[PDB]
CSV table of C-alpha atoms (C1' of nucleotides) in Angstrom, one decimal:
chain,number,residue,atom,x,y,z
A,1,UNK,CA,-26.4,4.0,10.6
A,2,UNK,CA,-22.9,3.8,12.0
A,3,UNK,CA,-23.1,6.8,14.4
A,4,UNK,CA,-26.2,5.5,16.2
A,5,UNK,CA,-24.9,2.2,17.6
A,6,UNK,CA,-21.5,3.3,19.1
A,7,UNK,CA,-23.1,2.6,22.6
A,8,UNK,CA,-23.4,-1.1,21.4
A,9,UNK,CA,-19.6,-1.0,20.8
A,10,UNK,CA,-18.8,0.3,24.3
A,11,UNK,CA,-21.3,-2.2,25.7
A,12,UNK,CA,-19.5,-5.1,24.0
A,13,UNK,CA,-15.9,-3.9,24.8
A,14,UNK,CA,-16.8,-3.2,28.4
A,15,UNK,CA,-16.0,-6.8,29.2
A,16,UNK,CA,-12.8,-7.2,27.3
A,17,UNK,CA,-11.0,-4.4,29.2
A,18,UNK,CA,-8.2,-6.0,31.2
A,19,UNK,CA,-7.1,-8.5,28.5
A,20,UNK,CA,-3.8,-6.8,27.6
A,21,UNK,CA,-5.1,-3.9,25.6
A,22,UNK,CA,-6.3,-0.4,26.3
A,23,UNK,CA,-10.0,0.4,26.6
A,24,UNK,CA,-9.9,2.9,23.7
A,25,UNK,CA,-8.2,0.5,21.3
A,26,UNK,CA,-11.1,-2.0,22.0
A,27,UNK,CA,-13.9,0.4,21.1
A,28,UNK,CA,-11.9,1.6,18.0
A,29,UNK,CA,-11.6,-1.9,16.6
A,30,UNK,CA,-15.2,-2.5,17.6
A,31,UNK,CA,-16.1,0.5,15.4
A,32,UNK,CA,-14.2,-1.1,12.5
A,33,UNK,CA,-16.3,-4.3,13.1
A,34,UNK,CA,-19.4,-2.1,13.3
A,35,UNK,CA,-18.7,-0.7,9.9
A,36,UNK,CA,-18.1,-4.1,8.4
A,37,UNK,CA,-21.5,-5.2,9.9
A,38,UNK,CA,-23.3,-2.1,8.5
A,39,UNK,CA,-21.9,-2.8,5.0
A,40,UNK,CA,-23.1,-6.5,4.9
A,41,UNK,CA,-26.5,-6.2,6.8
A,42,UNK,CA,-29.7,-7.6,5.4
A,43,UNK,CA,-33.0,-6.3,6.8
A,44,UNK,CA,-35.3,-8.9,5.4
A,45,UNK,CA,-34.7,-11.5,8.1
A,46,UNK,CA,-36.7,-9.5,10.7
A,47,UNK,CA,-33.9,-8.8,13.1
A,48,UNK,CA,-33.3,-5.2,13.9
A,49,UNK,CA,-29.6,-4.4,13.9
A,50,UNK,CA,-28.1,-5.7,17.1
A,51,UNK,CA,-28.2,-9.5,16.7
A,52,UNK,CA,-26.2,-9.1,13.4
A,53,UNK,CA,-23.8,-6.4,14.7
A,54,UNK,CA,-22.9,-8.1,17.9
A,55,UNK,CA,-21.1,-11.0,16.1
A,56,UNK,CA,-19.0,-8.7,14.0
A,57,UNK,CA,-18.1,-6.4,16.9
A,58,UNK,CA,-17.1,-9.4,19.0
A,59,UNK,CA,-15.1,-10.9,16.2
A,60,UNK,CA,-13.1,-7.6,15.6
A,61,UNK,CA,-12.4,-7.2,19.3
A,62,UNK,CA,-11.3,-10.8,19.7
A,63,UNK,CA,-9.1,-10.6,16.6
A,64,UNK,CA,-7.6,-7.4,18.0
A,65,UNK,CA,-6.7,-8.8,21.4
A,66,UNK,CA,-5.4,-12.1,19.9
A,67,UNK,CA,-2.8,-10.4,17.8
A,68,UNK,CA,-1.9,-6.9,19.2
A,69,UNK,CA,-1.7,-7.8,22.9
A,70,UNK,CA,1.7,-9.6,23.2
A,71,UNK,CA,5.2,-9.2,21.8
A,72,UNK,CA,5.6,-12.9,21.1
A,73,UNK,CA,2.5,-13.2,18.9
A,74,UNK,CA,0.7,-16.6,18.7
A,75,UNK,CA,-1.8,-17.0,15.9
A,76,UNK,CA,-5.4,-17.7,16.7
A,77,UNK,CA,-5.5,-21.2,15.4
A,78,UNK,CA,-2.5,-22.3,17.5
A,79,UNK,CA,-3.8,-20.7,20.7
B,1,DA,C1',-1.9,51.1,34.0
B,2,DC,C1',0.3,47.7,38.3
B,3,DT,C1',-0.1,43.4,42.8
B,4,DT,C1',-1.3,39.6,45.1
B,5,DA,C1',-3.4,34.3,44.5
B,6,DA,C1',-3.7,29.6,41.6
B,7,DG,C1',-1.6,26.4,39.2
B,8,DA,C1',2.2,23.9,37.0
B,9,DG,C1',7.0,22.1,37.1
B,10,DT,C1',11.2,20.1,39.2
B,11,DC,C1',14.6,18.6,42.4
B,12,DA,C1',15.2,16.2,47.4
B,13,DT,C1',23.4,12.0,48.8
B,14,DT,C1',26.7,7.8,47.6
B,15,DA,C1',28.1,2.7,47.4
B,16,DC,C1',27.1,-2.4,48.5
B,17,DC,C1',24.5,-7.1,50.2
B,18,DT,C1',20.2,-10.5,50.6
B,19,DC,C1',15.3,-12.3,49.3
B,20,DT,C1',10.7,-12.8,46.0
B,21,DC,C1',8.0,-11.9,41.6
B,22,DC,C1',7.2,-10.6,36.4
B,23,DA,C1',-0.7,-13.3,33.0
B,24,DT,C1',-4.5,-15.7,30.7
B,25,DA,C1',-8.9,-17.4,26.4
B,26,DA,C1',-14.1,-18.6,20.5
B,27,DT,C1',-15.6,-21.0,17.4
B,28,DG,C1',-14.7,-23.3,12.2
B,29,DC,C1',-13.5,-23.6,6.9
B,30,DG,C1',-11.4,-23.0,2.6
B,31,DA,C1',-7.4,-20.0,0.0
B,32,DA,C1',-3.2,-19.0,-0.3
B,33,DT,C1',1.4,-18.7,0.8
B,34,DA,C1',5.8,-20.2,3.0
B,35,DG,C1',8.4,-24.3,4.2
B,36,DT,C1',10.5,-28.7,3.6
B,37,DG,C1',11.8,-32.8,1.0
B,38,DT,C1',13.8,-35.0,-3.7
B,39,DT,C1',16.7,-35.7,-7.5
B,40,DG,C1',19.9,-34.3,-10.6
B,41,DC,C1',23.6,-31.5,-11.1
B,42,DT,C1',27.9,-28.1,-10.8
B,43,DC,C1',31.7,-26.0,-8.4
B,44,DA,C1',35.6,-24.9,-5.0
B,45,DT,C1',39.1,-27.1,-1.9
B,46,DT,C1',43.0,-30.2,-0.7
B,47,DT,C1',46.3,-34.1,-1.0
B,48,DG,C1',48.9,-37.9,-2.5
B,49,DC,C1',50.9,-38.6,-6.6
B,50,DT,C1',53.3,-37.8,-11.1
B,51,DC,C1',56.4,-35.3,-14.6
B,52,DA,C1',60.5,-32.1,-16.0
B,53,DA,C1',65.3,-29.7,-15.3
B,54,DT,C1',69.8,-29.9,-12.7
B,55,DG,C1',74.2,-30.4,-10.2
B,56,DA,C1',76.8,-33.7,-7.6
DNA sequence: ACTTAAGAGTCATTACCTCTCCATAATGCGAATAGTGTTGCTCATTTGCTCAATGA
């Protein structure tokens, strides 16, 4: 299930490119979020995979670029 | 068994003066931990003051 939606990870992380982080770091952290979405996925709500996986991939990419992008790190609640 | 081509690597002066320019984006909600305030308390530091011998 994980190695069939990596194209979804590169499709999400295509837009977060020039935000202070490398392109390969983004899709790596998106893969971490994709694994966390695979482990907690429920099929009985009719949705296929993508509407549940997109939120977790976007969350992992945003929490990656909110912390590991600057030296003087501001937490996400303060920013 | 040896001889020309392709590709990679590594340098190309010294010293000083002036100026500009060096960033933008998800939300929220408990859990848990670090931080700050409170009160009672002890301990080290210094200083004016006191007490005891002693010769003139």
